[PDB]
Amino acid sequence: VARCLMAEQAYRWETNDSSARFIKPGAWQGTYAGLLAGETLMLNLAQM
Amino acid sequence: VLQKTGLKTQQEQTQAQLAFLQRKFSNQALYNWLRGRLAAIYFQFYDLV
Amino acid sequence: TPEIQNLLDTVYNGLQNFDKNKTKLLAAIAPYIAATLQLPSENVAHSIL
Amino acid sequence: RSMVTQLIQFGSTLQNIIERQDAESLNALLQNQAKELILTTLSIQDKT
């Protein structure tokens, strides 16, 4: 998650939009032992 | 009489197995949640591809 | 209830990043409804909505 | 992207481990119930 936020800052500095965010919380679900985070992060990297 | 109390022991054992299959971690609700979440992510990723 | 609240949280994170004029709202919410109401099909979740 | 696919490998391994331990616990439960049942059938044979 830290490295994906690094990439999001790189996107926010390449093109000029500070308000535009892509990484949303809720990818980790502790009540189900955190299964399926890779899907959410891969989808969100695809959106970026 | 011993046959009857043996059958009641079998019934209580069946109740124990059913409570185990409900209260264990990977139960049916887990797979329902996974299939829903994975289906939504899969459809959106299909559109991007 | 915390279970219906879990439904709310899952649909909230799920249908986050939505636009109305991109696609139908019902088809977007249909997988989470099909999973949380444990429905087998997606046209059934369309039907009940 | 390399980090995310590493994470999704961990997710697959964790899914397999969870299903495997649930199968093992179910097996041990079946064995203990068989032990109780064989005690009852021994008492019935004595009465015979």
UniProtKB/TrEMBL annotation, chain B:
Name this polypeptide is given = TcdA4
Complete-protein stretch covered: 2091 to 2139 of 2381
From TrEMBL, chain D:
- Superkingdom is Bacteria
Q: What is this protein called?
A: TcdA4
State the gene name recorded for this protein: tcdA4
Residue window of the full protein shown: 1897 to 1944 of 2381
